[PDB]
Design a protein around this ligand. Structure first.
Ligand SMILES: *C/C=C(C)/C=C/C=C(C)/C=C/C1=C(C)CCCC1(C)C
Length: 137
């Protein structure tokens, strides 16, 4: 329940192979990998209500949602989707996404607070899972 806080990244991996699944170019993949490696996360949690600001060097994005309540966001490659977060356990939530227009890969993300005090974020596209690890700032 202590998801709230300021998180700085310490590990980011399998990122390029997630981007490959969609057709991101090698160059755009590489600069995406470097960008993804500077991510910062700001979380404000109030019960089942979440504000998450994730930012890189030149881009920042916010989401607000309630567990169980569909909301709108963007997949990895910017396609708008409706999303639904559910709890898996005390400190891990899973988010299913469904494309609002057309077809594409099945995408989903997770967030978890470990007992070591790490925030683990994963993002999935079909068979492929990226993972990022953060510590409190
Ligand atoms: C809790 C949520 C987190 C840690 C979200 C992190 C999001 C990213 C690392 C997103 C990365 C990318 C895209 C969605 C598309 C544009 C390029 C990237 C690689 C920065």
């Amino acid at each position: 329940p202590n998801f709230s806080g300021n998180w700085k990244i310490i590990r980011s991996e399998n990122f390029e192979e997630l981007l490959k699944v969609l057709g991101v170019n090698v160059m755009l993949r590489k600069i995406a990998v470097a960008a993804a490696s500077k991510y910062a996360v700001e979380i404000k949690q109030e019960g089942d209500t979440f504000y998450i600001k994730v930012s890189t060097t030149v881009y920042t994005t916010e989401i607000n949602f309630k567990v169980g309540e569909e909301f709108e966001e963007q997949t990895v490659d910017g396609r708008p989707c409706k999303s639904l977060v559910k709890w898996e356990s005390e400190n891990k939530m899973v988010c299913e996404q469904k494309l609002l227009k057309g077809e594409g890969p099945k995408t989903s993300w997770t967030k978890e607070l470990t007992n070591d005090g790490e925030l683990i974020w994963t993002m999935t596209a079909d068979d492929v899972v990226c993972t990022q690890v953060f510590v409190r700032e």
